[PDB]
Amino acid sequence: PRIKKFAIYRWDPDKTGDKPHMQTYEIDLNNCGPMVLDALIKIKNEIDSTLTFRRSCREGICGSCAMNINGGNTLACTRRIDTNLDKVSKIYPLPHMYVIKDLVPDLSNFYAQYKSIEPYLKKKDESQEGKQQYLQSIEEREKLDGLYECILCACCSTSCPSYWWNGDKYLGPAVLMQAYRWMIDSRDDFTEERLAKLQDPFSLYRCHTIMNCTGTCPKGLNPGKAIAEIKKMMATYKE
Amino acid sequence: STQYPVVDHEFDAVVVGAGGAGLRAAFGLSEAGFNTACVTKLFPTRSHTVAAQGGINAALGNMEEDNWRWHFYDTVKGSDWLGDQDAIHYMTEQAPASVVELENYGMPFSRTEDGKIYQRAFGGQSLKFGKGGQAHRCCCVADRTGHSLLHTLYGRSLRYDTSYFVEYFALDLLMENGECRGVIALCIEDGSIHRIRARNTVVATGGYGRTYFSCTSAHTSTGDGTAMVTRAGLPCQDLEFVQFHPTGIYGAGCLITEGCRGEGGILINSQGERFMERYAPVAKDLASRDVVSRSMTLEIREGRGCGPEKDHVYLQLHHLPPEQLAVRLPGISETAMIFAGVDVTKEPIPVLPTVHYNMGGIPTNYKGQVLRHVNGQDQVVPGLYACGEAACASVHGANRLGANSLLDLVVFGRACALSIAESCRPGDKVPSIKPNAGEESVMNLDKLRFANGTIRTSELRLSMQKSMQSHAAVFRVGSVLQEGCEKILRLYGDLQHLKTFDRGMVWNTDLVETLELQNLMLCALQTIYGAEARKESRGAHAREDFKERVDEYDYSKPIQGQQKKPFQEHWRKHTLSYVDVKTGKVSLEYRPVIDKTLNEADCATVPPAIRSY
Amino acid sequence: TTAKEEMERFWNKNLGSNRPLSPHITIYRWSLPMAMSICHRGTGIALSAGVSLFGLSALLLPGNFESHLELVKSLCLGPTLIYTAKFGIVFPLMYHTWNGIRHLIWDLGKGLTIPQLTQSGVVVLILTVLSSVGLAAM
Amino acid sequence: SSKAASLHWTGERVVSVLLLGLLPAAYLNPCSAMDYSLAAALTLHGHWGIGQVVTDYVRGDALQKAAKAGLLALSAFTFAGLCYFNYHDVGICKAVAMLWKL
């Protein structure tokens, strides 16, 4: 029987004048799943049911369980526990975010920024919609690979230090990549004014190529490359 | 009761559930011009529709020239003649219309040399009414088709002034004198209780896969709208019909798509033989979901296992070209790498039949209106609609055909919106609710918040999941089902002896998972009682004792030179089940299936026949 | 509700509540890309402060540059300490120059993958040492 | 919709490659004409560099207005200091040359 230690961030808004602290739980790795989420569920079921976290698919394709494990930001159902018992796994919520309770952060600002970029097809004339299928050639379709797979786990944006200092005015890796997605979507006629929307110091130009977004992405996507690719389009469009 | 703050909201239409079906109904209502409020316990993106990997069926005719009426025949043949043909007509005709609608919204569909949407071969489908070989009509965005569907529905839903109640757990329906008035909902975010009254209400809460121990469904797929309907004294249809998807990973119970089998994937047992040619001759490993899984679960009973305890079968993707897997099936290539710890291009993936889809649910006509059973007849419940997995327009019948559920979402979600737009106008009188209404739903919540018993939430949940897994499996006999029935009945009595720990208002997961447990149990009772009473083998429901397919006529031999069986004698009928919440007693009755189509001249009614692909 | 309203209601709820901000720098995993970007800011500020203190001294301080060089030879001549102060000037300059090229290569779109980033990061780190020692002794 | 933030970004990259090209140009060809061009590029790139640091850390409009104005005064003083040094005194090319061989 192998016993693993888990130190987890804890805060209760209902407790009178409570200060944020850490709490350690002991778990047998033979009667538990391989992933960190399985361990969190195990202590939820038996040890401590006060623990509060986001979870859904346990598959790594919904983005609910996004959190900070032993440093980086990854999905808890994708990251497997280190079998090395000599280390204590420290579990935190996403960095620089308002904690609602324990590992649950407020992502309201994150979703709100995603709305401001308009993530839907905009045609110049929509009198022929709902009847025709828009043609997109195989080569033009390939330009979406790496962009559409985004799950909105918010790991990349919350890994950005420039998002910690300016989380109100800087859109962040996740939202910025989706702007780019709808830019080269050759079915979208509104590519120009989408770029004109980023014509302020903060929206796009708070990026300084720190590359913490690309490194932490649990889906293996490259947000940083996409932001730099926008920057080029921004300098190369007329009228 | 003086403790909880009641905040009343007023709207034109409420859509409980923000999945694939929920979104199409939500934004479609505001597209018509309704003051629409969407309630959801998850964020719209996190909904279980992201897990969808296969595709969405449409008879566009992109690979080979296609007709939609063949897709009609395939679905009703797959439904084992329990599917209501009026609904199947509407879905298969609106199939090319809805997919074109989704592609125009922004769905990044895979493409061919022609530049059109890429369709693929899938299990259950055939050309020329089951005569012209294999059919290719499964529209897909590589392998993240359902994920991309939910994203391009969400993105498009921000174009309209739809109000969203993100992370709001819907408790019960606001009901007065057999008329729907809205919903009472708990806000997980702070702990408050909100009564959201509207002239119409759409229930799209998805399936109840969490009732079992092993399933491909999410931790949130507990099927609560089904229980909300149940607690109102309304019936639930065909809840015994639980689809066991053949290809699910042995480890965590995750799903790998039928698209694996569609491209040219083969199922291999310990002998090395292609064992799916042994059972199914014409269709082979690309047949109905109940056919393939039935072979798999029987191969284990013999002793032909392939694991450390001889309990699972193998799915092989070794022979397929490496470039085919990288382009067409990348979503399953990465998920099988993590959970199974096994490569896709050289090594085979361990598969096991697991709980996947619930064709049963809330009784529904083709328009999307919720039906109740009065005097052996069908009555429409005023202002109550249902679409998606939680609904049961019985477009799937006894067995769902692959890649039809995403179609079920988009078509019937839209149909729910169109039915409201015609029956009433935006700005019509919103029915006033009683001041002391829904207080019993709050009283129920207050007990579980301060629950002090002997069994915990998790322990009683485990006792339910394991009991359903061992008893109500793929094969089930009367003696086994009856022991399970009284075992599930005992656990419902134990729901008064439950112990809780968290007393907080803000984010009480210890409380909401117990709210889910009450709703899971109610969905478990009707599943097990409906299964034990049904003395036939039809689709997914297979009795070892009665392997006979009982219809009105014996359709195996010539027709009309034959005696027609009475209604309470055969078993080609829907299972409507009520359950008294107070004592936990199941009382069930039956209603006939709809054979007529919407137009006989345009689409012929397909009579029951010998079913084997 | 609009996208601008959603943000405005976000800050009014959180700033007027007893919610704690989640630890970030205190716990986040240190990496080379993150550390090398901080040094570019560090050297950037230090170099500007050096230039500014050179321009302002030309206006607000008496005596010509030749008189200041004769003033430099105060505490002996500095055996190898004259090399150390000369290394302390060229070291932050050379890091910023080589790392600045890497930034300029990035703005073209090249070398923005994790394997490429760790590689070209060492290339900048090694060139800094060789160019600084190479110019200090001249 | 005049694109100002994009041209500023382009302006940053143009003066960066210019200053990178002016360092070998000053070493290979050290003259009075090279002194002013190096002084112009050095003070411009520096001013725009700090401008990014200011817009990242200085929170709120209350202190941001004084920070950009306070920087602009320092940048003008720095450029004027170098132009005085190049015209009257030794010159920044020969100044390094004398400092290095000590």
Ligand SMILES: *Cc1cc2c(cc1C)nc1c(=O)[nH]c(=O)nc-1n2C[C@H](O)[C@H](O)[C@H](O)COP(=O)(O)OP(=O)(O)OC[C@H]1O[C@@H](n2cnc3c(N)ncnc32)[C@H](O)[C@@H]1O
């Ligand atoms: C499990 C599964 C299913 C699946 C699939 C792959 C997997 C792993 N792949 C499919 C495919 O390729 N093609 C296809 O046609 N179907 C496929 N399926 C089946 C299908 O995806 C499901 O039937 C579908 O996901 C159901 O969608 P629906 O919109 O009807 O339901 P949902 O997506 O699960 O959303 C439910 C929402 O309800 C909200 N909500 C709000 N309040 C509550 C309460 N109180 N209780 C429960 N739910 C509530 C939730 O927030 C959720 O968003």
Ligand code: HEM
């Ligand atoms: C000739 C060699 C140099 C090159 C190639 C260069 C290039 C660059 C570039 C491209 C940036 C912007 C990074 C970005 O945000 O994308 C930068 C930053 C900066 N540089 Fe330079 N530079 C050089 C020399 C200098 C010098 C001599 C100074 C001092 C006066 C200086 C001061 C700064 C400052 C203050 C910043 C701000 C840091 C930041 O970008 O956040 N640079 N450098």
Ligand SMILES: O=C(Nc1cccc(Oc2c(F)c(F)c(F)c(F)c2F)c1)c1ccccc1C(F)(F)F
């Ligand atoms: O400072 C930048 N990164 C950054 C990343 C991580 C931490 C950080 O603070 C520091 C720091 F550095 C230290 F040494 C400390 F001891 C310390 F206690 C900090 F809190 C700054 C940065 C670098 C380049 C461009 C833009 C930035 C920007 F925008 F501000 F994010």
Ligand code: SF4
């Ligand atoms: S780009 Fe990656 S890290 Fe960022 S939100 Fe999307 S999946 Fe998450």
Ligand code: F3S
């Ligand atoms: S982590 Fe942040 S700085 Fe830019 S490339 Fe990155 S968004």
Ligand code: FES
């Ligand atoms: S829970 Fe779906 S991503 Fe971890």
